Design a protein around this ligand. Structure first.
Ligand SMILES: [Cl-]
Length: 254
């Protein structure tokens, strides 16, 4: 059996719905009370159990509100999720990486007992939009013990992520003019090791701000990636492999 399995056997409809089956509550992490980042909102399942934990970073000039819909949707599938604000809205990717790391530590050690007791601190993931997606890549290369990483329309000036060993799903936007897939998302995916679990999903007819809007495909494949790799939940493999969307690549079957 799999002791990390939660919720029903998945279907396309259940993954595309506005919320998963877990009702979620919220707990604030205030800016001054949060060491190493600018605070945020922790979404957690009311159902008492232990879950993987996920930290999500917005991009340049962005606040947690630009990723709020996605933190809540992922939590409604059985995860503890914090959407952070950064120290400043101008912080750069490698700074956002340290803030993502501090946010994981915050949920584990500084949040209330209701939050901490719902976390399996051995099962963690990071995600990020644009520069926060670059921060995701940087933290992943620094922390090989992370279970999953999901950069969303990522932005970074370093294109060499061959040091990343964390199962990584990159989501690009074909019409992105701020982080063009040709010079960001695609070289990122290609430079990740051929020997790790990884995938590249390029959204069709989407702009750089597609991750900031409730999006059926982003929620579906983000949850599937997290279920498969944070929860070891192989009921979700058949949605990642062979996969769907303008372009899809992967090291399926994994
Ligand atoms: Cl609160």
């Amino acid at each position: 059996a799999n002791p990390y399995e939660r919720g029903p056997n998945p279907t396309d409809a259940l993954l595309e719905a506005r919320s998963g089956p877990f009702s979620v509550s919220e707990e604030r992490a205030s800016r001054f009370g949060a060491d190493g980042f600018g605070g945020g909102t922790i979404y957690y399942p009311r159902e008492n159990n232990t879950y993987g934990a996920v930290a999500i970073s917005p991009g340049y000039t962005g606040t947690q509100a630009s990723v709020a819909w996605l933190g809540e949707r992922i939590a409604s599938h059985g995860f503890v999720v914090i959407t952070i604000d950064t120290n400043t809205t101008l912080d750069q990717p490698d700074s956002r990486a340290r803030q993502l790391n501090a946010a994981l530590d915050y949920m584990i050690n500084d949040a209330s007992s209701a939050v901490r007791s719902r976390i399996d601190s051995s099962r963690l993931a990071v995600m990020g939009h644009s520069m926060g997606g670059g921060g995701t890549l940087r933290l992943a290369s620094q922390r090989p013990d992370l279970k999953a990483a999901i950069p969303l329309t990522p932005w970074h000036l370093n294109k060499n992520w061959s040091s990343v060993r964390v199962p990584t799903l990159i989501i690009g936007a074909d019409l992105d003019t701020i982080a063009p897939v040709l010079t960001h998302a695609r070289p990122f995916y290609n430079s990740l090791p051929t020997s790790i679990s990884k995938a590249y999903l390029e959204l069709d007819g989407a702009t750089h701000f597609a991750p900031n809007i409730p999006n059926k495909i982003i929620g579906k494949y983000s949850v599937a990636w997290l279920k498969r790799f944070v929860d070891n939940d192989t009921r979700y493999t058949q949605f990642l492999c062979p996969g769907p969307v303008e372009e899809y690549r992967s090291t399926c079957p994994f």
